Every structure is written in structure tokens, then in C-alpha cells.
Design a protein around this ligand. Sequence first.
Ligand code: CLA
Ligand code: CLA
Ligand code: CLA
Ligand code: CLA
Ligand SMILES: CC1=C(/C=C/C(C)=C/C=C/C(C)=C/C=C/C=C(C)/C=C/C=C(C)/C=C/C2=C(C)CCCC2(C)C)C(C)(C)CCC1
Ligand SMILES: CC1=C(C/C=C(\C)CCC[C@H](C)CCC[C@H](C)CCCC(C)C)C(=O)c2ccccc2C1=O
Ligand code: SF4
Ligand code: SF4
Ligand code: SF4
Lengths: 143, 33, 65, 40, 137, 161, 80, 741
Amino acid sequence: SEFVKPFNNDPFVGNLSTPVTTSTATKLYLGNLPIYRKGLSPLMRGLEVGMAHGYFLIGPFYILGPLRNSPNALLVGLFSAYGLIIILTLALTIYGLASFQDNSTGSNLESSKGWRSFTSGFTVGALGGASVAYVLLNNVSFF
Amino acid sequence: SFLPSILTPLVTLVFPGLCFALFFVLIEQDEIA
Amino acid sequence: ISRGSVVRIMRPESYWFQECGSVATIAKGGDRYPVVVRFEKVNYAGVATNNFAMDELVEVEAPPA
Amino acid sequence: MSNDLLKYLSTAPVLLTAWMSITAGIIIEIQRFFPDSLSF
Amino acid sequence: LLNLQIPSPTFGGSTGGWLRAAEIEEKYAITWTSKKEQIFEMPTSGAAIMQKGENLLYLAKKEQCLALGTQLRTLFKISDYKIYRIFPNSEVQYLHPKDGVFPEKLNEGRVGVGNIGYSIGKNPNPVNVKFTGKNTF
Amino acid sequence: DVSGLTPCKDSAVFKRRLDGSVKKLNSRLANYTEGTPAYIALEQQIEQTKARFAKYGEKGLLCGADGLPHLIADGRLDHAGEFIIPGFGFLYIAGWIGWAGRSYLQFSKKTDKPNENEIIINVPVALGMMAGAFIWPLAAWKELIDGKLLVPGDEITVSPR
Amino acid sequence: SHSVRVYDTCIGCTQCVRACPCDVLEMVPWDGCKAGQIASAPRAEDCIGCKRCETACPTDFLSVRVYLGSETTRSLGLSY
Amino acid sequence: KVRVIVDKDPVATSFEKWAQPGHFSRTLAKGPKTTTWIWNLHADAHDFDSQTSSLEDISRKIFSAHFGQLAIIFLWVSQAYFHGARFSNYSAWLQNPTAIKPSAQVVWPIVGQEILNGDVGGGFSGVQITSGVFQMWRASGITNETELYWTAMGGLVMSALMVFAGWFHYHKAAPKLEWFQNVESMMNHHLAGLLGLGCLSWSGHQIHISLPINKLLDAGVAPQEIPLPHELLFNQDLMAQLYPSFKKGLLPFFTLNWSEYSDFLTFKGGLNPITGSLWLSDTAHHHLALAVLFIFAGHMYRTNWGIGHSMKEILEAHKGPLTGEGHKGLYEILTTSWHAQLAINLAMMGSLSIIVAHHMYAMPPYPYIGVDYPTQLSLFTHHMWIGGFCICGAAAHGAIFMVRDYSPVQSYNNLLDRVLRHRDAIISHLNWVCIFLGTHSFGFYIHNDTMRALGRPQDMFSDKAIQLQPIFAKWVQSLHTLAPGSTAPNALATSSYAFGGDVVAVNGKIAMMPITLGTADFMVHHIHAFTIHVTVLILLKGVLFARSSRLIPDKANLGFRFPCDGPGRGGTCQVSAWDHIFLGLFWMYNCISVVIFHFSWKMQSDVWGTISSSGKISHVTGGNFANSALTINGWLRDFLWSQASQVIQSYGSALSAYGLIFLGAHFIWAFSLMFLFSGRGYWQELIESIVWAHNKLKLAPAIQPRALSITQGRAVGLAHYLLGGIGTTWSFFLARIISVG
Ligand code: CLA
Ligand code: CLA
Ligand code: CLA
Ligand code: CLA
Ligand SMILES: CC1=C(/C=C/C(C)=C/C=C/C(C)=C/C=C/C=C(C)/C=C/C=C(C)/C=C/C2=C(C)CCCC2(C)C)C(C)(C)CCC1
Ligand SMILES: CC1=C(C/C=C(\C)CCC[C@H](C)CCC[C@H](C)CCCC(C)C)C(=O)c2ccccc2C1=O
Ligand code: SF4
Ligand code: SF4
Ligand code: SF4
């Protein structure tokens, strides 16, 4: 009872159709993640990715930062998250500039306009997510 | 003075980061047509 | 030079440059390098014979009698 | 023993080992009989 | 040129196959004929079964194709292998047995390319070709 | 006297070193009893140490401020035994070795199978070459005069210049 | 791509073509050699530069010679 | 049918092929033309598979070579026993083990080397040994030198017998391949016959000769008044006086009243307070139980009678959905190829040597070996090094099997084929594991160094700033400490005192003590894991990509060890599985060096030392591991610089030999870098110039000199590197431990 078969019935492609690669759970989770979800605009993809990453980026800096044992621990963590997000979106912009040099299609992550929209969504979402995480950690007594 | 605080991060983080970004983009620029 | 003779190589790029070698065969007609000089000193590749031109060889000892 | 074993003993490593053992023995015995000779 | 519908060898798949570059720059194909169905070793890691009759295989390198051809020649004595280069435009260029016979056999229709009329150690010095676009060979 | 050194006979530091070595052994000596192999061996050790120091004093070696012998190698015959006499001895022995090797190579090449003669030594003639190399300085001079020591220059490969 | 050259010291041994793993070399008719053939490199663009031809060449110095030069995907032999 | 079939007089006994050096190899049989022939002779000396093509002849050669190896091993055991008999203070040590330093080597007085005959006590001068053979013989019950002399003579007789057997089984009566391929019978005889009867006989020896002599020695009877073993063997009255259960005879064995032997067959555990080692009654019970286990195990596989298993069917029955045909074909692979068997056996031998190292220090088996600190360190380090070497040999011979004896016809779609078909995924995932593990583990150390240098100890990964506690290791230690009451009720004490419990001490020195784990132990253990993972990455990549790779599709055609495939494709340097082994030997060297350094520092700081009457525990280094092992600076200062004093200050003393070997090992390690960094082309051109100089004087040899091959240069560099490193650590550890302990 074989469970590892050729990828898309192609023995000569460098891949295997394992349970990890091809199972229904993997397909569902991957295809429903924002980067692969159907119908989402590049702005919406970038926005979702941005809030998801900016929400959790604050935590390492807040807990394990140099000023963890200081009254300004959370503020310093938020500023660190903002700086890291600035670096991340600068990386995104230069990546778009290097990769999608000539393009006129748009509405596609592999085009200049689409990648710019994705980066804009990522920046706004990450800033908002870091701010929301700051608010939650300030009001941690609620939970 | 305050010049160390103003200048050391400016010249050792912001300027080298921008230089690395510019160099990367320039080396990745393709041939003109 | 002649079959059975001992000839000194003069090709600059040869492993056996300015060394003696026993002539084993001279090809007639074509064969830009007709003489076939055989050595007892193997080169780096390991071959102990090579083809040479007339002017690349210098006669030092005629064949026996 | 035979020509074959004599040839084998005449092989290079056996002869080197024997000759260097003889040389080391000569040096060691010279050191024993004239020890600590820093100069002539 | 190439049928693109020949049955391929039976193979269970491998991770040594082409990865995102054969489908965008160039792929390679090798087609041969076998008298019996039999097991052979792929240039990529694994064991495949070449089918009875015609067989077609895909690869990512002319080196891989030539290695498989050598394997077929010196193990199964199959010398009917022919190799093609497939571009993303689906242009097919028949490459290895270009004259219909292998390079080792002599044919009169081949013209000398890169043949020099003097011995190896008679090339010009680099100083002679300095500040010029040519080279010493 | 040369370079501010003094003989080891009148060398307070040399004498102090001798007494220190003797006192160190005699101390180590306390562990073992009289008449045992270790005790007699340590007595030999002490005697050899004293003999070495006495011989170094008698030989005329120069002892520096550190109290150890210093060898003078410039050519002065007052200290010939340090370098000049051992130097000539080594030169003779080394030329003996080189001459035996060279003469055996000259023989072995003339043989039908020189490649096998190098890794399986013809000992009966090799011993002959080792013996005959005792007179190498005259043999080398004779071969040089007869033009058989050096191979001419254009009979030896040389790479492309 | 690398530059493959064949000099007239060839002796038509056809061993370079056998050592060739990329079909860069082939025998073509010739007058100088007694075997009536000489190696030639009509497909130097496929050369990778492993110099198996040079290894297999039995001449005192190499009749077939490979000069490394501009790198390409084929010359680098990248499957990706 | 399993039966004996041999060929009579398969080879003639003659010296003609002694005279002919390269007779075995087709290429070397012609004769030498260059000095590379000489190297190739030794390289291909024992490559029987390349020399011939008959598996029968290869098996016969291997069998008689094993006989020769056994002869050498017997000569080695003979040297140990004879030197103990003749040139040792074993009698004095037996009379007073704690005070007398064991020594069994004496140097002659030639060039002032008699200083090496240091004061070892007992009116004896010699070189102190660290092999533990004295404690071994004390456990065995040897109390006099005549016994050592006679067992040495017996070992010599056995070595001569092994040489004769090796001659006989190749030149007079050589077996057949059918005889060799009886793996089921071989396993039956090695389980039940070799291991089972070996354990049974050792248990009998212990029960009859070792328990009485050791119990009397611990009581206080000096060796002269000890009854001799031949007296103790049959005198049941004396054995009953010592152990009362012996008066009941063998009836409590034949009837199943085995509890009657509880006195001399115990389950006490822990360490004997007198000798600070394992109970010999426990050891006897252990070996007897193992004898029963192995004799039971050895009746599994089929032979001339119907009963039994077959490994072919056992393997073929084990196949799953994610494995296709499963283990089909592996029986044929392991019956036809010697290299696969060598690989598996070397891997297990090396891992077993490492396990031996880990167990012997924690549970000192021989009397007065725990207090003998040089012996413990020496044995642990030695067996760790042997284990690493054997594991890399396993990888190398697996690669050799892949290159030579692999064939898809037999392995179509089995586990080997399926592993080759996703080697890329395997190696990429192990690569990620290596990067992650190394980054985190070494970045802890680098972060700690940076914080200490910046004057921020509160930001460290220390036991008091940011704790990385080994909660699971501590939990396992707690379980093992509570085991003797709850989960091992019949055991009175813990298996080892390292987990916890009392501090076993003999005289002042501490034999064993609980080993506490903390942040430094967490860091160094994860460093161990990272090093092991990178070594596995290199070796596994070499084995998997032995056949071919994306860079060279025909790597198998070139061979197992080949220098390269030219400068094409950007450079194909060290693509061979041999070169992968060459690279992995550096990495196991790094791994084992870090492991032995961890062992040495942890034991000198936290276990070894002296305990006073009041209970004060004073360690060799003073428990500095827990606070100084957090930084590479602390490792450099408090371990290397601090403990190198006993080595560098050794001149003019008995350890001057260790100082000289320290310097020489450093020299050899540095010398190796020449071969490791340089290349053959430079040396060939230099040799050309020197050959011109010799030709000018008409003495250029007929065997033309050549630079070493590329593979040989790598091998020479690796060998010198390993020798220098291992010698440096050897001298350093021995000098330090002999001086301080
Ligand atoms: C090559 C010479 C040199 C070097 C190695 C440094 C080094 C330093 N300066 Mg600078 N500095 C220099 C010349 C130099 N300075 C000169 C001529 C001036 C103008 C008066 C200044 C004015 C200055 C101020 C006001 C301050 C520093 C400070 C510093 C420190 C932090 C770095 C920083 O951001 O300052 C860079 C600031 C500048 C104004 C730089 C001006 C431009 C210089 C001359 C460029 C040199 C380029 C070099 C020749 C070629 C580069 C080659 C390339 C391949 C790398 C550091 C020790 C800070 C300090 O003291 O921290 C504790 C600080 O506050 N410097
Ligand atoms: C790799 C090892 C290592 C580790 C574990 C740490 C850890 C730390 N360092 Mg650092 N440090 C290191 C190496 C390391 N260091 C080295 C090599 C240096 C020398 C240059 C330093 C120098 C240094 C300094 C100078 C300082 C620190 C500090 C710190 C602390 C905060 C750093 C921070 O803000 O991180 C931010 C980290 C992140 C934003 C992300 C980390 C990665 C995330 C958690 C991974 C999650 C993966 C996830 C499971 C993937 C799958 C998800 C999927 C299933 C959904 C923290 C204790 C600071 C401090 O105060 O120390 C107490 C500080 O001042 N370090
Ligand atoms: C059971 C053990 C075992 C066995 C039976 C074999 C058998 C074999 N191995 Mg080996 N091998 C082993 C363990 C073993 N190996 C281990 C532990 C390793 C890991 C290091 C290797 C790694 C290895 C490699 C990488 C290769 C082999 C190869 C071979 C084959 C040829 C070996 C030969 O002719 O050497 C003859 C003996 C020599 C050339 C002498 C070697 C000398 C060593 C390097 C140095 C010794 C130093 C000394 C102990 C200390 C010096 C001290 C100083 C102060 C003087 C042969 C089938 C080769 C092959 O082609 O296999 C098919 C091959 O390429 N083996
Ligand atoms: C100190 C010397 C040194 C160093 C630093 C390395 C480093 C490495 N070797 Mg090794 N190697 C060495 C000596 C060394 N080697 C020697 C002498 C040899 C010859 C025998 C080899 C031969 C060799 C082979 C053959 C292989 C390796 C591999 C590796 C990698 C292991 C994976 C890993 O943990 O990466 C992580 C990096 C490190 C452990 C280095 C230090 C990391 C610090 C804590 C910083 C990390 C944080 C951050 C990213 C960077 C810092 C900030 C920066 C921006 C300023 C790694 C890059 C293996 C590999 O590539 O596996 C994937 C591999 O196959 N090495
Ligand atoms: C799958 C899975 C997993 C994982 C998980 C994860 C990965 C998670 C994550 C999570 C997260 C990571 C989350 C996040 C969240 C976020 C949020 C919730 C956010 C929000 C935001 C906001 C709301 C914003 C706002 C704004 C904007 C937008 C802009 C402007 C400003 C403002 C502020 C207005 C595990 C392992 C468990 C296992 C099982 C499975
Ligand atoms: C130093 C070095 C050499 C030079 C070494 C050579 C030519 C071989 C040296 C072997 C010697 C001859 C071994 C024996 C040394 C004895 C001390 C010589 C005296 C005994 C004679 C009778 C032979 C290489 O050839 C080489 C090749 C490839 C990578 C690295 C290196 C490399 O590092
Ligand atoms: S010399 Fe080289 S190119 Fe000429 S025939 Fe021989 S292998 Fe071919
Ligand atoms: S360089 Fe490589 S590809 Fe080119 S001819 Fe030589 S072997 Fe063939
Ligand atoms: S140095 Fe050796 S391994 Fe490296 S490219 Fe050159 S030949 Fe190949």
C-alpha cells in the first residue's frame, strides 16, 4: 500500500507526494493561509501577514530585552518591534525593486504594483499589530 | 557633547544600511533592454 | 633520425626536453611528426613514448651494427 | 635461507629497518661508553 | 522531432529531479529502445524500470543525459539513445548523435572547429596580446 | 675570556649547579633503602653527574653568567673541538654516505632492471660501494677532473623558461 | 563558455571523445595523422571544464586543451 | 544443510611473492616507475575486493587476517601480564593500594632518561601507568607474580596458536563461501557459544576464585596468607566458612531454591565501601544472568534441524505502507558484501566503546580504581576516542559498499532505494538542524562572553541571571535515586551514585559523588548534540551521495576515493565519499575533544577531590565549573591555561616526558597544516627543481620522485592532525591528573 508517489504523476520532478506535502490537511491550511488564499487582494494579504507578525514581534523584546527589569520594558519592546518592522518593510521594498524591475500588470504579487501594495499592507498591519499587542500587555490584568 | 549620540547611530546603522540596500538594488539592476 | 638510434629531444614543451630517447619507428608520407621516440623515463601521465618531428631531434649515437 | 627470502630481506624497508637499528645501536652504545660528550 | 507521448520508465519518484529551472530555462529528454523490460539506475538517485520497446526520460542536464547514455551503452548495449533539449517555447533541439553516429566514429561530413595549425607551445605571449581583445590560442 | 665568558673551572654558578643536582638526587635518594637496585642505580646517577661536571670543567669550556657551557664557533683553534673537529668528522661521514649512494646509483642504472634494483638492493655490491666510499674525497676529485661528476648542462631537462 | 582547442600533435586516438561527458568533441577527417582523423570541438558551448579529455590525452603534452573562461548555466552545470 | 566444506592446500607456502612486492595488484605487479607506486602498494595492501573478484578468496583472506590480528592481540595481553609480573610494583600496590602509585614500566639509563623512573612508592622506580591493569588483576584475584608470569606464557602460547591457525586456514585447509555464508549458525555460536559460555566461565571464575580472595583482602588478610586458588576451588569447607550458602552444594541450583545462594549472588548495587567499586558478588550474578540470556538468545536461528528462525523471512516480513517492499534484499546484501557487515559492526563497536566509557566512570567496577584518578580519566578518554574512530570507519565502509557492492537489481524499491530517493530532503533537514543547534548552543556562550565583557552579568545565560535548567535530566536523576525503594525493590542502593545518594569515599579521596546538572551542563550538552549532528551530516551526506549527485551524475564510475572531477562546474573538489570521511574525521575529533574536556573539568570540579573527617568536601579545582564554564573565556582561562601549569612546569621531573610529548604533539599538529592547506602542483614543481639539482650530479633515481597524490596529501594531513591533537590532549591530561591526583 504505497503512500509516497510521484508529484503530480511525474516521476522525474524533484519532489514526492508524501502525506506531509500533499495531504488534505496540508492543502487546506496552506491554501487558506493569506499568502495563498483565493480572492484576497495583495493589500489584504500584506495586511493579514503584517498584523500576524507584528502582534508577536513585540514579545521577545519585551520579555528578554535589556530593559526587561525596568518600568519602560513594554515601551522599549514596542520601539524595538517598530524598528524591526521598519527594517522588514525596507527589505520588502528593495526586494520588490530588485525582482520586479519591469512590470505593468498589477494585482499580482509577482508584479511591481502588487508587491508594493503587499508591502504597504504589511507595514500598516505590523504597526497596528504591535500597537494592539502593547495595549493588551498594558491591560494584561483583564485576562 | 551630544554629537556622539546624534552621529554614531546615524553613520553606523542608518547610513550603512542604506548603502547596503542601494548596493544590493544596483547589483540586481538588469541590462537596459 | 633513424631506427634504432638514440636522439636528444629539442621540443621545448616536452617532458623529455634535452633528454635522449631510442627511435622506434619513422612514418613515411604524411605524419607531421613521423619519428616515434620511446623513452624509459615515464612522464606525469605515465606514457613512455611520443611522436616527434625531424628537426625536433638531434642525433647523438647511431644504431648498432 | 633461500634466494627468495634473501631477496625479501634485501627489499628496501627491511634493509632500512635493519640498517637504522644498527645505527641506533651504535649510537646508543657509544653514548653508554663515552657519555655526555659535549665537545671533542 | 520528438513524440512527447512515448511511455516512460516505471519509477517511484525522487528528489533529484528538475527544480523550477528546467521548466523556465531548458529541460532535456532522452529516448531509447529496450529489448526487455529491465531495471536500471537513474542518474538521479533511485532505480527505474525501462519498459519493453520505446522509453522516454526527462532530465535537467546534458551531463545527466550523457551519463545515462553511457550507462545504457556499457551495461544494456542500447546504442539507439537520442537526446533532445526542450525549451520553454516547446522547441526541441536534437543534440547528441547529431550526424546519426556517435562522435567516436569518423564521418566525412564533420568540419574541424577549434583546430590549431601549430604545436601547443607556440602560442603568442600575453604581452603580445596585451590591450587587445584576442587571447593566446 | 672571549665575549666576557670565563672557564667553567672557576665558575661559581657552575659549581652551584653541580651541588644543586647532587643535592636533588641525594634527596630523592631518601625513599629507597641501602643496597637495593634503585639505591645503587641512583648512586650511579650521582657518580655520572659528578663525572660529567668534572669533565666539562677539565675540557676548558667557557661558562657564562647563567652557569652553562657556551660554545665558540668562529674559527679560533683554542676552541677547535667545539665545531671544527666535529665539523670535519661530520663532513667526512656525510660525504661517505653520499658517495656510497651515488656510486650505487651509477651501478644500478647500468643494470637490466634499474627500477627493481632500487627497491630491492643488490646487497653484495651495495656493501662494496659502502666500503669503497671511504676514499670519497680523492674519488670525487678524480671524477671531477675526468668530467664524470657533473652531467653537462644541456643534457638535463629544464622547463620552458 | 570555455574554449576547447586541438593542436596538430594529435594522433587520432579518439580517447578524448570517449572521456568527454558532454559530447563536446568529435573526430573529423585529417591529413596530418596516419589514422586519418583529428579531434575537434564544434560544441564548446556545452563544455563544463572537467578536463577528462586532457586526462585521457596520451601525447607528451596535451593535443586537446581546455581554457576556462566565461561562466554560464551549462558551464557551471547547475540543475537549478 | 549447515556443514563444513573446505579446500585442501589452496595456496603454496613460498617466499617468491615475498620477494615480489606488488604481486597482489594487477597494476603494481609490473613494477615501479615512480614513487607513487610505493604509496599505492600500502594503500591497496588490504583491499582484497579490488585485488581479486572471488568472494570465496576474499573471505579466506579475511578469516586468516583475523587470525593474525588475534595473534597480535594475544601478544599485547602477554606484554601487559608479563610487564606486571617482572617490571612492576604490583606486590607493593597489592599490600598498600591507596598509597602506592601503580607502575609497570622501567626505562634504562642511557641519555639521562632515568629521571623518568620516578618515585612511585614501595621501593620501586619506574613510569607510572594509567591502564587500570593493577585493579583489573586485583578484581581477578591475582595476588602473586608467578600467576602473572604463567598467564603471560599462556598468552604467548595462544599467540603462537593463532599464527598457526591463520597459516593453516589459508595455506592448508581454507573454507568455502558456502561455509562462510552460514550466518544463522554463526550467530547461534557467537551468542550461545562465544558470549554465553564466556559469561558462564567468567561467572564461575568469579564465584570460585574472585569472591573469596577479594573478601579476604578487604577483611585485611595480607596476600601471603591468602589460600591459593587451587585450594579454594575444591575446598568446600573454606568456601562455606566464607559464604555459608556453599555448604548446601548444587542441589539448591538443580532444585529451584535459587534463593539459598543469596549471600554470594546479590543485588546490592551501589559501591563497596571498602574498595569504592562495584560488588563482585553483584558482578558474578550479573555475568551469570547474562550467560543465561545469551545461551537463550543463541537458539533463535535455523540450522541442520527444523526448529529456528530465518533472517531472510524475518526481514521480508517487515514492510509498511511508507516503505514499499521494506527490508527485502538486505539479507542478500549482508550475505554477499563484507563492507556492509563491516559498517554495521564498526558503528556498533564504536557506540559500545562510548557506552563503556560512560558506564565505567559512573560505576567503578574494579577495586581502588575510583580513587585512582589517572586511570578513570585515561580509560574514559581512550574509549571515547576509539568509539569516534570506529563510527567514522562505519561511515567509510558504508560508503564503500554504496560505491562498489550496491546494485538496483537487488534493491529495487527497498529501504536503501527509498532512502537514496530522498537523500536531498534528509540532508537538507539535517543541515537545518545543525545550523539551528549550533547557532543556539554556541550563541549562548558568545552572548555570555559579550555580556561579561560589557559588565552585564545580570544579562547572562547563567544559573542566577537567565537559567537554562535541565529539567528532564534532573527528573531522570530523581527517578533513578528513588528507584531502589519503589521501582527496584530488591535493589538496596542506586545503580550509580552520580544520580544521587551518599558520597562514597575511600581514605580521603572521593571515589564517587552525585553530579549536579545546571545551566553549564545544559549548554555543554547541547554543544555535544550540535557536534554529533554535524558529524552525522558530513558522514551521512558522504554515504548517500556516494553513487552520484546533482553536480556529478556519474560519481560511482570514478570510484570510492578519487581526487576530484576537474575544475569544471565551478570546481568539484572533495566530491568523493572518501573526502567526506576525511572531513568528518575532523568533526568527530572536535566532538570527542569537547566531550573529554567537559568530562575532565566537571569531574575535577565537582566529583573528584578529598573529604575530611568533619565532612568538608574539597575538590581539585574547587567547583569552578558551574560559574566559569558559561563562557569561552572561562573555558580558555580556568581549564586550559589553569591546568596547563602541571604540563609546562614538568621539566626536570618524572613528567618531563609528558612535557616533551606535549611540545612534540603541538609540533606534529602544526606540521599537518602544511599538507592540509598546500597542493600537489607546487610540490611537484619544487621536486622538479630538486630533480634537476640531482641530475646535475648524475644521481637522479630510476624511480622518479613525485609529489604525493591529492588523496594521499589529504590523508597525511589528517593523520598528522589527529596524531598531534590526540597526543597533546594525552600528555596534558596525564601530566595534570598524575600531578594533582
Ligand atoms: C578617517 C578618519 C576618522 C575616523 C576613523 C573617525 C572615527 C570616529 N568618529 Mg569621526 N571625524 C573625523 C574623522 C574620523 N572619525 C573628522 C575629520 C571629523 C570632522 C571634524 C570627525 C568628526 C566627528 C565627530 C563630531 C564625532 C566623530 C565620532 C567618531 C566615532 C564614531 C563614528 C561616527 O559616526 O563618526 C563619524 C562622524 C563624522 C563627522 C565623520 C566625517 C567624515 C570622515 C572624515 C570620513 C572618513 C572617511 C575615510 C577617510 C575613508 C573611508 C574608506 C572606506 C573604504 C571605509 C569614531 C571613533 C563621534 C564620537 O566621538 O563618538 C564617540 C562624534 O561624535 N567624528
Ligand atoms: C543564538 C543565541 C542567542 C540567544 C538565544 C540570545 C538571546 C538573547 N540575546 Mg543575544 N546575542 C547572541 C546570541 C544569542 N542571544 C550573540 C551571538 C551575541 C553577540 C553579538 C549577542 C549579543 C547580545 C546583546 C548585546 C544583547 C543580547 C540580548 C539578548 C536577549 C534579547 C535579544 C532580543 O531582543 O531578541 C529578539 C528576538 C526576536 C525578535 C526573535 C527571536 C526568534 C523567535 C522567538 C523564533 C521563533 C521560531 C518559531 C518557533 C518558528 C516556527 C513557528 C511556526 C510553527 C508557526 C536574549 C536573552 C539582549 C539582552 O538584554 O540580553 C539579556 C542584549 O542586550 N544578545
Ligand atoms: C575493523 C576495522 C577495519 C577494517 C577491517 C578495515 C579495512 C579496510 N579499510 Mg578501513 N577504516 C577503519 C577500520 C577498518 N578498515 C576505520 C576505523 C576507519 C576510520 C578512520 C577507516 C577508514 C577507511 C577509509 C577512509 C578507507 C579505508 C580503507 C580500507 C581498506 C584498505 C585499508 C588498507 O589497505 O590499509 C593498509 C594500512 C595502511 C595504509 C596503514 C594506515 C596507517 C594509519 C593511517 C596511521 C597509523 C598511525 C599509528 C597508529 C600511530 C603512529 C604513531 C607515531 C608516533 C609513529 C580495507 C578494506 C580504504 C578503501 O579503499 O577501502 C575499500 C579507504 O579508503 N578505511
Ligand atoms: C571556529 C571555526 C569554525 C566555524 C565558526 C565553523 C562554522 C561552521 N561549520 Mg565548520 N569547520 C571548521 C571550523 C569552523 N566551522 C573547520 C576547521 C573545518 C575543517 C575540518 C570545518 C569543516 C566544516 C564542514 C565540512 C562543515 C562545517 C559546517 C559548519 C557550519 C555548522 C552549522 C552551524 O552551526 O552554523 C551556525 C554558525 C556557527 C555555529 C558559527 C557561530 C555562530 C554565532 C553564535 C552567531 C550566529 C548568529 C547570527 C546569525 C550571526 C552573528 C551576528 C553577525 C551578523 C555579526 C558552520 C557555518 C557544516 C555545515 O555547513 O552545516 C550546515 C559542514 O558541513 N564545517
Ligand atoms: C497553526 C498551528 C500552530 C501555530 C499557531 C500560530 C502560528 C499562531 C499565531 C498567532 C498570532 C501571531 C496571532 C496574531 C494575532 C493578531 C492580531 C489579533 C492583530 C490585530 C491587529 C489590529 C486590530 C490592528 C489594527 C490597526 C491596523 C490594522 C492599522 C492601523 C492601526 C490599528 C491599531 C488601528 C501551533 C504551533 C500552535 C500548532 C497547531 C497548529
Ligand atoms: C609537504 C608536502 C609535500 C612534499 C612531500 C613529498 C614529496 C613526499 C615526502 C615523503 C617522504 C620522502 C617520506 C620519508 C621522509 C624521510 C624523513 C626521508 C628519509 C628516508 C629516505 C631513505 C627516503 C607533498 O608532496 C604534498 C602533496 C600534496 C599535498 C600536500 C603536500 C605537502 O604538504
Ligand atoms: S592526442 Fe588527445 S585529441 Fe589527439 S587523438 Fe589522442 S586523445 Fe584525441
Ligand atoms: S572540458 Fe569536459 S566537457 Fe569539455 S571536452 Fe573536456 S571532458 Fe568534455
Ligand atoms: S585543487 Fe585539486 S580538488 Fe581542487 S580543483 Fe584543482 S584538482 Fe580539483
